[PDB]
Design a protein around this nucleic acid. Structure first.
Ligand SMILES: [Zn+2]
Ligand SMILES: [Zn+2]
Ligand SMILES: [Zn+2]
Ligand SMILES: [Zn+2]
Lengths: 75, 75
DNA sequence: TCGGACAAAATGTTCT
DNA sequence: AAGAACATTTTGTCCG
């Protein structure tokens, strides 16, 4: 009820359509708006938790999108 | 040879006993001088190349050790 | 070579 | 729920 759905950290509230923490909220906006081409170094199935969420932006971003995060969600 | 044995970027010379780039040189020094309680988000065999070497410090440090890097290489 | 200082990228928190 | 500003962590380059 107060776990980030992306990294399981303590969730602040609902951001861009999904219960997430502050760090995943800002990560998501940066991933969408910025140009990076994230690439997984594993098997496209990395564990994303409070510690490990720094280790694979590709899998973190993929999880944000799959949980349904969207920038224009207030519309 | 002219390629870093850890990440396959252009090597800048032989550092801590091994042909490596400057980024792997300082990454290793920082890991050995400091803490290196890193956690892999995959299965401890992450691919370490020029872009993905940022992803997993745990597997990067393992690759430095496996290549034989050591601080007292000189003396 | 090795390492300090500087610089940049990447991530996270506070405040409105 | 959203985003600007700041702060920290992590990484990489220069060394007129
Ligand atoms: Zn999160
Ligand atoms: Zn991954
Ligand atoms: Zn390297
Ligand atoms: Zn790994």
């Amino acid at each position: 009820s107060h776990m980030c759905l992306v990294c399981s950290d303590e969730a602040s509230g609902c951001h861009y359509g999904v219960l997430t923490c502050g760090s995943c909220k800002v990560f998501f906006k940066r991933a969408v708006e910025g140009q990076h081409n994230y690439l997984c170094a594993g098997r496209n199935d990395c564990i994303i938790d409070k510690i490990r969420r720094k280790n694979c932006p590709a899998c973190r971003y993929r999880k944000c999108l799959q949980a349904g995060m969207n920038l224009e969600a207030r519309k």
